[PDB]
Each structure stands twice: as C-alpha cells, then as structure tokens.
Ligand binder design. Structure first.
Ligand SMILES: COCC(COC)n1c(-c2cc(C)c(=O)n(C)c2)nc2cc(N3CCOCC3)ccc21
Length: 125
C-alpha cells in the first residue's frame, strides 16, 4: 500500500483568467480556512504510508485537500469558481466517507465546513 500522485495543480492545455470570485476564493475563503485551528489535517493529501491507513485510497478514489486547492488557485488552474467550490465539497465529503461519527477529524471537518459556508455566502457577483 502506497500513496497516489497528488491531484494535478497545472493543465498546460487549459486557458487562464483572473476573476473577482477566484481572487476572493484564494485571499478570503482559502486563507481564512488555512489559518483555522483545525485546518492542519486538511492542508496536504492524506499520507496513507506515514499515517498507516492502507485502506484510505481503496475507499477514497477522488482525494482532495486544501494544499491542492491553494496551489490550483495560485496557478490559475480554475476557470470557474464552481470548480474550486466542488473541490472543497469533495474534501469534506471524503472525510465523512472514510471516518466515523464522533471521530476528532469529523468534528474538525464540520467546523471548517461551517466557516466555509459563512465565507462563500459573501462571494462577490
Ligand atoms: C485529526 O486528524 C488525525 C489524522 C490521523 O490519521 C491517522 N490525520 C490526518 C487525516 C486527515 C484526513 C482528512 C483524514 O481523512 N484522515 C483519515 C486522516 N492527517 C494527519 C496529518 C498529521 N500530521 C501532523 C504533523 O505533521 C504532519 C501531518 C497527523 C494526523 C493526521
């Protein structure tokens, strides 16, 4: 059991643009979640070898983490704000698929998801 390569943070065969929404997702949404006290388990891909979680990448076939989302925003990987919001949703959903109710990681995901929703609420037009 080993780790997959992390998600792509670059697509050479994809146009790029700067929008108010993408800038807000990096500078306000991601930055706010990144600095939250419960951010640390979500700042990098799950390392199944280091943490000894051999069934993680048997159960989770669409991994996502805030380190990947950060790099995607910084590299102008996303064309649509929807793509970035979908990646956050995937990250939270994976946590609820793999882990059990009352697990520390699940209550941490709940706290971050609540904050995420409050910040996306004020996403500009
Ligand atoms: C609160 O989460 C605890 C779990 C423990 O998994 C066995 N965990 C995850 C983790 C995260 C997610 C989203 C998940 O689903 N699982 C199962 C584990 N990522 C981690 C990273 C670290 N370290 C801290 C020191 O620096 C290196 C990294 C330490 C613990 C971690």
């Amino acid at each position: 059991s080993m780790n997959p390569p992390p998600p792509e943070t670059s697509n050479p065969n994809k146009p790029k643009r700067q929008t108010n929404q993408l800038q807000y997702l990096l500078r306000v949404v991601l930055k706010t979640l990144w600095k939250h006290q419960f951010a640390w388990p979500f700042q990098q891909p799950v390392d199944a070898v280091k943490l000894n979680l051999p069934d993680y990448y048997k159960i989770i076939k669409t991994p996502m983490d805030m380190g990947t989302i950060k790099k995607r925003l910084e590299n102008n990987y996303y064309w649509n704000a929807q793509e970035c919001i979908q990646d956050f949703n995937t990250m939270f959903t994976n946590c609820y698929i793999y882990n059990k109710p009352g697990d520390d990681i699940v209550l941490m995901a709940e706290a971050l998801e609540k904050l995420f929703l409050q910040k996306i609420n004020e996403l500009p037009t």
